[PDB]
Amino acid sequence: ETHINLKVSDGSSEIFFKIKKTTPLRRLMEAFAKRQLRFLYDGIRIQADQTPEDLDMEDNDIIEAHREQIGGSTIVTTESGLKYEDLTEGSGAEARAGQTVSVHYTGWLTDGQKFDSSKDRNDPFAFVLGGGMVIKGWDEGVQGMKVGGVRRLTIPPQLGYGARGAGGVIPPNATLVFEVELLDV
Numbered sequence: 633e634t635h636i637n638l639k640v641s642d643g644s645s646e647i648f649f650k651i652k653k654t655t656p657l658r659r660l661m662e663a664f665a666k667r668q669l670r671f672l673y674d675g676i677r678i679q680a681d682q683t684p685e686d687l688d689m690e691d692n693d694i695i696e697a698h699r700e701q702i703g704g705s706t707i708v709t710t711e712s713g714l715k716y717e718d719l720t721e722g723s724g725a726e727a728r729a730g731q732t733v734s735v736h737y738t739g740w741l742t743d744g745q746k747f748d749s750s751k752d753r754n755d756p757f758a759f760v761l762g763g764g765m766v767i768k769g770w771d772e773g774v775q776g777m778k779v780g781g782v783r784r785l786t787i788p789p790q791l792g793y794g795a796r797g798a799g800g801v802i803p804p805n806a807t808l809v810f811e812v813e814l815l816d817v
């Protein structure tokens with residue numbers, strides 16, 4: 633009765649935070665940020681010193697967490713059907729085919745489950761870009777990234793694993809969401 637659960641959606645996954653209706657939303661923001669900013673509720677910017685009571689929130693209301701660049705972002709759909717969104721631009725020469733890139737990544741399914749993260753093995757992933765050493769959506773989507781950049785790829789099944797799936801948990805005909813952080817070239 634005195635507590636409320638709030639669903640925070642950042643464009644990759646949904647994470648819930650339960651807090652007392654009189655706890656400042658600062659606690660939710662900090663907890664979210666610590667996991668890895670602009671939070672919106674019904675399109676209005678949440679201030680840290682505001683409580684759920686102040687904003688007339690109800691259980692399981694949704695908060696949008698915006699981790700992208702100040703000024704906003706866009707989701708690009710290319711000729712292949714790949715979608716990508718530059719959350720952070722970074723700076724440097726753009727990644728080109730033939731370069732060996734080192735990244736951190738996290739992947740999620742449509743059902744919201746996280747299926748992998750290179751951060752969970754604490755182990756950067758490196759590959760020759762444009763070599764067919766990764767799924768098609770990665771060969772296309774990592775091209776153009778710059779060091780320090782964070783790009784979110786929404787990969788349709790034809791640019792992923794199609795009707796086969798992979799890794800046990802990626803089912804047939806799955807759209808995949810990856811966040812890729814370019815560490816080095």
Ligand SMILES: C=CC[C@@H]1/C=C(\C)C[C@H](C)C[C@H](OC)[C@H]2O[C@@](O)(C(=O)C(=O)N3CCCC[C@H]3C(=O)O[C@H](/C(C)=C/[C@@H]3CC[C@@H](O)[C@H](OC)C3)[C@H](C)[C@@H](O)CC1=O)[C@H](C)C[C@@H]2OC
Pocket residue numbers: 737739747748757765766767770792793794798799802
């Ligand atoms: C010699 C082989 C071992 C070699 C393994 C590694 C270097 C370790 C490396 C961190 C992979 C992870 O190991 C913990 C793990 O990564 C996933 O969890 C994952 O997030 C994923 O989807 N990734 C990984 C990150 C790049 C994008 C994508 C991928 O393209 O991965 C590629 C992939 C699976 C391509 C298939 C290959 C078969 C084709 O038929 C299919 O064609 C559509 C495409 C990987 C990099 C392969 O090129 C190389 C390998 O496989 C898979 C769900 C399962 C996979 O474990 C196996």
